[PDB]
Amino acid sequence: ASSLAPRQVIRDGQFITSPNGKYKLVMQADGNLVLYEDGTKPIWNTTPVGPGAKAVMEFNLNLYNKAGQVAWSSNVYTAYLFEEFKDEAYLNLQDDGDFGIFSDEAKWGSIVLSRPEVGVKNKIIPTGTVMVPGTEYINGNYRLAFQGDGNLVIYQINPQVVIWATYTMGADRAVVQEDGNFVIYKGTTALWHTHTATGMPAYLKFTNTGKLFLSQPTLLWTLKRGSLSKPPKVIPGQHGPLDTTPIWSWPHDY
Numbered sequence: 001a002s003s004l005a006p007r008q009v010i011r012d013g014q015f016i017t018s019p020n021g022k023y024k025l026v027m028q029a030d031g032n033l034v035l036y037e038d039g040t041k042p043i044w045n046t047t048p049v050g051p052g053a054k055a056v057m058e059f060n061l062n063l064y065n066k067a068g069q070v071a072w073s074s075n076v077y078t079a080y081l082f083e084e085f086k087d088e089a090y091l092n093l094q095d096d097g098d099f100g101i102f103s104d105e106a107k108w109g110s111i112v113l114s115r116p117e118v119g120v121k122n123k124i125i126p127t128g129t130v131m132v133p134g135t136e137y138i139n140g141n142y143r144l145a146f147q148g149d150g151n152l153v154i155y156q157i158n159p160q161v162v163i164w165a166t167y168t169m170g171a172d173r174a175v176v177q178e179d180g181n182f183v184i185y186k187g188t189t190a191l192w193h194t195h196t197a198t199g200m201p202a203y204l205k206f207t208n209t210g211k212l213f214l215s216q217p218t219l220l221w222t223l224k225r226g227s228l229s230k231p232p233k234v235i236p237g238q239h240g241p242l243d244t245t246p247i248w249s250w251p252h253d254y
């Protein structure tokens with residue numbers, strides 16, 4: 001895996017790896033968070049905090065000691081750190097060895113939430129996905145289907161219940177676009193879309209509570225570039241056999 005999911009913990013020699021296999025970020029049993037090149041050359045570290053330590057992705061990437069204190073932190077510059085950000089923010093380790101933190105706000109949703117869903121889990125539908133009639137996605141007791149008849153439907157699986165639909169009869173494709181929009185089409189005719197064309201790539205989240213949201217990557221911080229006041233344009237990365245988060249890369253300079 002090349003990423004860390006919200007709240008993920010790693011410790012005692014657990015690690016992630018850049019898509020190309022060259023860089024590895026390992027939270028060591030001696031409590032040193034270390035970036036390795038080719039498996040053998042360490043090229044960055046926190047330095048060790050000692051045994052019983054751990055690293056957790058919780059808005060910041062935070063290094064804790066046995067005693068439960070934070071010993072090192074990404075120290076991402078934030079207005080507020082709302083507890084819900086810790087449930088949302090994720091990290092990617094990329095092919096030139098940089099790693100960065102994303103915290104993305106929903107741009108669109110099948111429904112408007114009065115407040116965050118506790119312990120919700122998102123099935124990520126990545127930028128560039130083209131759904132074709134017959135495509136479906138399953139998360140818990142819900143199913144997102146792009147149907148033979150062109151409708152995009154969210155069903156509760158057992159018992160079977162329609163929760164939401166677009167009624168885009170005759171659509172032959174739905175595209176999660178690089179420009180930021182999610183668009184259902186017959187041919188080149190857009191029958192329905194989210195109105196989120198920003199030029200920052202889209203991805204979708206399909207929840208285990210029967211909801212769909214579109215977000216776009218908002219890169220806040222990298223190891224090499226520190227905190228970023230404006231999020232740069234990033235590009236879909238190589239989805240891994242299973243990663244749980246979106247995967248991106250970002251340019252080295254301008």
Ligand SMILES: C[C@H]1O[C@H](O)[C@@H](O)[C@@H](O)[C@@H]1O
Pocket residue numbers: 147148149150
């Ligand atoms: C699987 C679904 O596929 C069709 O497209 C639609 O009309 C439904 O009647 C059917 O249940």
Ligand SMILES: C[C@H]1O[C@H](O)[C@@H](O)[C@@H](O)[C@@H]1O
Pocket residue numbers: 147149151153162164165
């Ligand atoms: C929401 C419903 O809308 C249409 O009736 C058709 O696409 C069905 O299969 C679908 O379940």
Ligand SMILES: C[C@H]1O[C@H](O)[C@@H](O)[C@@H](O)[C@@H]1O
Pocket residue numbers: 177179181183190193197
């Ligand atoms: C509805 C249209 O909105 C934007 O122009 C762009 O996202 C197009 O691809 C889209 O189809």
